[PDB]
Amino acid sequence: VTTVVATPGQGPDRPQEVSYTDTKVIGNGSFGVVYQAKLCDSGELVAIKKVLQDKRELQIMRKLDHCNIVRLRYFFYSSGEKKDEVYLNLVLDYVPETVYRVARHYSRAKQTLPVIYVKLYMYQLFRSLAYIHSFGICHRDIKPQNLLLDPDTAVLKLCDFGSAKQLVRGEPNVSYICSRYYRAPELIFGATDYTSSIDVWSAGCVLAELLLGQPIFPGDSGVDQLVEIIKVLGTPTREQIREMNPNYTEFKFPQIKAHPWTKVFRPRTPPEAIALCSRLLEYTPTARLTPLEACAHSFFDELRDPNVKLPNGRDTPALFNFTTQELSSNPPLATILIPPHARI
Numbered sequence: 001v002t003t004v005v006a007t008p009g010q011g012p013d014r015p016q017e018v019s020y021t022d023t024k025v026i027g028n029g030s031f032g033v034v035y036q037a038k039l040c041d042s043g044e045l046v047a048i049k050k051v052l053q054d055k056r057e058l059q060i061m062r063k064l065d066h067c068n069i070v071r072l073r074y075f076f077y078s079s080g081e082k083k084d085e086v087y088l089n090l091v092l093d094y095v096p097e098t099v100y101r102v103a104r105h106y107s108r109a110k111q112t113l114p115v116i117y118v119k120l121y122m123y124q125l126f127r128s129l130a131y132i133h134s135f136g137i138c139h140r141d142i143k144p145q146n147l148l149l150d151p152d153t154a155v156l157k158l159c160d161f162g163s164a165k166q167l168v169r170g171e172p173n174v175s176y177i178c179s180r181y182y183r184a185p186e187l188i189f190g191a192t193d194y195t196s197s198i199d200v201w202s203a204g205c206v207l208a209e210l211l212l213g214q215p216i217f218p219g220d221s222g223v224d225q226l227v228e229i230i231k232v233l234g235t236p237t238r239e240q241i242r243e244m245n246p247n248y249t250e251f252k253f254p255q256i257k258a259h260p261w262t263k264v265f266r267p268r269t270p271p272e273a274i275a276l277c278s279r280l281l282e283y284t285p286t287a288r289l290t291p292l293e294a295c296a297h298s299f300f301d302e303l304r305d306p307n308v309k310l311p312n313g314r315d316t317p318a319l320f321n322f323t324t325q326e327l328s329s330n331p332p333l334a335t336i337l338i339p340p341h342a343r344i
């Protein structure tokens with residue numbers, strides 16, 4: 001029942017005994033294995049991610065500090081299933097749900113996720129992206145499963161930095177990255193010089209999925225993923241193909257008309273949600289809004305209303321405590337982002 005381990009963790013390099021109990025398996029996958037546990041001293045729930053080390057998550061997790069990113073409490077090396085292999089354990093903050101599971105509850109119940117939650121969850125996702133992109137860090141795996149959620153407080157926390165990397169101009173990066181459904185079209189065209197706007201495309205895919213109740217681009221392969229994008233956005237132009245990958249020149253594809261954005265979504269869909277979505281799911285990577293510009297979109301105006309409350313009656317979580325680092329990409333947007341009632 002009680003497991004005792006020694007571990008340094010974030011902040012100062014000082015290993016200490018951490019005792020936890022009520023260990024339970026959350027899930028298994030590409031990430032490794034994630035367990036739920038309770039810290040004995042405080043009685044706080046935590047998520048322990050055990051990963052086998054062979055063949056940058058730790059490096060990135062020790063530097064990040066944000067309200068919409070799951071924090072690293074502690075980290076330790078241990079034994080595991082495989083003898084003589086080294087396993088890294090990340091003790092992170094526990095959040096009970098995922099955007100995937102919450103969206104799946106509403107879909108199975110023939111409902112669309114309420115707009116108030118679509119606004120709250122997307123705003124906090126873009127806010128977490130504005131923060132990591134201000135350090136040049138691209139997540140490269142934005143999807144509903146990686147967006148942790150606390151249903152009662154409506155707090156969203158971005159997790160799983162196992163695909164994350166600091167993008168530097170001049171250094172190439174792998175094109176086969178991101179879960180296929182949320183993969184930006186530059187990556188499909190084999191671009192190695194892509195930017196952090198691949199996460200904005202992936203966030204646009206998450207937004208569209210919450211408005212439709214099912215993935216907008218459910219491709220069965222890298223090639224079929226592009227067919228799903230073309231069926232909605234229409235055939236990309238030469239300029240768009242050059243913008244996505246400057247070294248691709250061989251795209252022969254039939255002329256498919258774009259599906260108008262008003263027709264993609266159901267008639268009850270708010271126009272501002274559609275308008276925001278059209279500025280994220282753009283072929284040209286530079287034409288996409290930055291995460292900080294997405295936060296300042298008119299679709300999130302209700303969150304900036306002094307009288308906004310969650311359906312349960314609680315206040316919204318913290319949305320306007322922006323740091324200077326977080327506003328770096330566009331300091332003048334602080335006028336829109338921090339409303340009159342939230343300033344000082």
Ligand SMILES: CN1CCN(c2ccc(NCCNc3ccc([N+](=O)[O-])c(N)n3)nc2-c2ccc(Cl)cc2Cl)C(=O)C1
Binds near residue numbers: 031
């Ligand atoms: C294939 N799998 C099956 C399980 N599964 C799943 C089911 C329910 C929950 N509920 C939230 C529980 N808490 C939690 C989880 C992860 C972290 N984390 O930092 O990674 C933290 N801090 N907390 N999460 C997960 C989950 C999400 C992301 C990652 Cl990487 C790992 C897991 Cl198991 C999946 O999405 C897909």
